[PDB]
Write a structure and sequence with these properties.
part of a larger assembly, 2 chains, A: mainly alpha, 1 helix, rod-shaped, B: alpha+beta, Ubiquitin-like (UB roll), de novo design (two linked rop proteins), 2 domains, 5-stranded mixed sheet, 9 helices, 53% helix, 12% strand, binds flavin mononucleotide, binds iron/sulfur cluster, NADH dehydrogenase [ubiquinone] flavoprotein 1, mitochondrial (chain B)
Chain lengths: 56, 216
């Protein structure tokens, strides 16, 4: 946050806890809005043999 | 009836059934015509007693394998429809129905095709599968579709494009053709790939390995 240190002290004394450690507003620690592409594995029934449907 | 079966009958009648049954093992009676072709010094057609061992026939009537008996790679004993057998089996196997059935290869038409150690076995089996693809009548679904499918798969196997898992897939595909068609042409197409996979799987695997390593 952009609050001055006196206001930080007043907030921490009024609430009784250090508010600057755990802020309600999220600033820059969240994930990027652009992500690399995924790969997404397939599954257990994607075999080429020994995979007759009557057995599963 | 086959022409050989019809043609031997008057001689059997004249000389008696006992004379014909004196040759060969039990339930494997009589004489037989053999066509030895492929990698032999003297490919030919001969008449011989039924249960003659394969090695004796090859080295006596066909002049032996080209380059010596130690140069032998594989033998197709009864025409294209029979599974091939490696050199280790041909040392003691006999040329009749029962012994070749116990060798998982069958006697067929007694047409021996000899492939030496300079043979690309995958290419030979793929050529046989191409023959069967060109000879299928197309009537029933398993032959009409699956034989073409196996032809494409074996063509890719020859280069090495495939992955090892596909080998098992190919096996299953053949099993889906055999016993599910109108006539026995489907069986005759399924059996050669089964023999090739049974006896020469490392060759296919190393071909795929070399293709992958060459093409990143
Ligand atoms: C695809 C296919 C092709 C065949 N071609 C011949 C052939 O060209 N000549 C032959 O004698 N039998 C051929 N047969 C086997 C015949 O069924 C066989 O001739 C017939 O059963 C005669 O029986 P026999 O051997 O007791 O005389 C073929 C079988 C199949 C499945
Ligand atoms: S198995 Fe026989 S009947 Fe069926 S498509 Fe092949 S040749 Fe025709």
């Amino acid at each position: 946050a952009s609050a001055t240190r006196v206001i930080q002290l007043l907030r921490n004394w009024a609430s009784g806890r250090d508010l600057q450690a755990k802020l309600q507003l999220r600033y820059q620690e969240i994930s990027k809005r652009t992500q690399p592409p995924p790969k997404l594995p397939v599954g257990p029934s994607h075999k080429l043999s020994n995979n007759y449907y009557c057995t599963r | 009836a086959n022409v050989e079966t019809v043609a031997v009958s008057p001689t059997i009648c004249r000389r008696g059934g006992a004379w014909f049954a004196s040759f060969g093992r039990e339930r494997n009676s009589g004489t037989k015509l053999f066509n030895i072709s492929g990698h032999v010094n003297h490919p030919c057609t001969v008449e011989e007693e039924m249960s003659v061992p394969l090695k004796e026939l090859i080295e006596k009537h066909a002049g032996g394998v080209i380059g010596g008996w130690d140069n032998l790679l594989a033998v197709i004993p009864g025409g294209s429809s029979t599974p091939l057998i490696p050199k280790s089996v041909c040392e003691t196997v006999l040329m009749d129905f029962d012994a070749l059935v116990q060798a998982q290869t069958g006697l067929g038409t007694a047409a021996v095709i000899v492939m030496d150690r300079s043979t690309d076995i995958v290419k030979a089996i793929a050529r046989l599968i191409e023959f069967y693809k060109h000879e299928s009548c197309g009537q029933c679904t398993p032959c009409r579709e699956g034989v073409d499918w196996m032809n494409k798969v074996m063509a890719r196997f020859v280069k090495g494009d495939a992955r090892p898992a596909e080998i098992d897939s190919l096996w299953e595909i053949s099993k889906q053709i055999e016993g599910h068609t109108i006539c026995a042409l489907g069986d005759g197409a399924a059996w050669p790939v089964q023999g090739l996979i049974r006896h020469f799987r490392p060759e296919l695997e190393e071909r795929m390995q070399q293709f992958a390593l060459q093409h990143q």
